[PDB]
Amino acid sequence: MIRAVFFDSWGTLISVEGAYKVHFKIMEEVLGDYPLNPKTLLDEYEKLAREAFSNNAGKPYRPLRDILEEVMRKLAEKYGFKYPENLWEISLRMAQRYGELYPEVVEVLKSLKGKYHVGVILNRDTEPSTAFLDALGIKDLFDSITTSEEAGFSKPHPRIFELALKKAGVKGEKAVCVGPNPVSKNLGMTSILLDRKGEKREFWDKADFIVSDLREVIKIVDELNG
Template sequence: MKLNNIEHVFFDLDHTLWDFEKNSELAFKEIFEKQKIAIEIDEFLKVYSPINFRYWELYRNNSVSKEALRYGRLKESFDSLKFETEDATINEIAHEYIEYLPKNNHLLEGSLELLELFKNKYRLHIITNGFEEVQHKKMKSSGIHQYFETITTSEEAGVKKPHPGIFQTAMDKSGANIDRSVMIGDNLEADIIGAHKFGLQVIYLNSENNGEQRQFPQVQKLKELLDYL
């Protein structure tokens, strides 16, 4: 079912357009080789991924700081793997990860093709909880920065999705009419429920086909957005 009268399309970035999992794996591979960390990447990521997800939930709810997130997710992962390393090394890896991560440029399947189709049809924007100093670099290295009129980060807004304040900041920056705007993202709580409560139309990118929520329009692949837009 097509959404009518849409003029502004707001995207989340990580896990929605930018392939966070692939790019994160490449960053850790490079860092572990440099630091001589004797852990298989697949083994590390199996432990790290759910820990990282939990830390981002805590960060979104203001339960941990940015610094605590960067250190804690690594510390817990190494501890779970019974890999002993000094705090100084963990802090160094945390710093290098932020440096190396945005250098990788893999996008999710269909991202560029979709943006090419949308660029002359809609005004495009990003709303992200990612860190200010990293998100712009990610977009530039992956070649998608030029598609977006505005990029609103949680650090700029002072609040994180699903807080209405970040959506209001994005509206103010873009000059968008809420009734003519749609939010697309992969996180049901932060992107979809948050935007819906604010008053935006939403489309849930449910790549993993998790659960059976039927309240909101959803797609598994980016190309399926053409069914709605």
């Protein structure tokens, strides 16, 4: 029986257009009048960030604030602009102004409520993530919010999923996990790959179900439950 539905990474709640704009706007604010194209700074940032994330994947958790600040110091040094004070505060402001949900998110979370444990799982520090979910008006639509900071280890370490399952009070075989991240499997969860654009086909056989829209999740859960 499926009793719990977990949604995995911001990548599943937040549109690609909203994430890029948030980032783009952060870069414009940092640069001011500096004569660098904000899209070039953004593209270099995403490379260095991706690279920090992989170097910490599966390792003891390290705050994303520290990794972000480290990246930006390299970027400030590379391009010659002054390192921005209060970068974390800029980023939070921009996420609240320009962040956006995929259009079905609110409907999907309400549809699950009181019927399944509804949880979100995030490789983000606890406090920002939670304030961001509050800004987007959905914090209270979750039964649980589980972070790498809570568990002590960044993805793909199993501990974050073990904690999420403990919050739901069920073993992995009773839960589905929805994410864009191809695979945690050891714990028994049913994996649903969210491929909005059908651009990850080479990982579809690595997942139990593929969906392009979160409204398909409740249909999969009902079929699993008869």
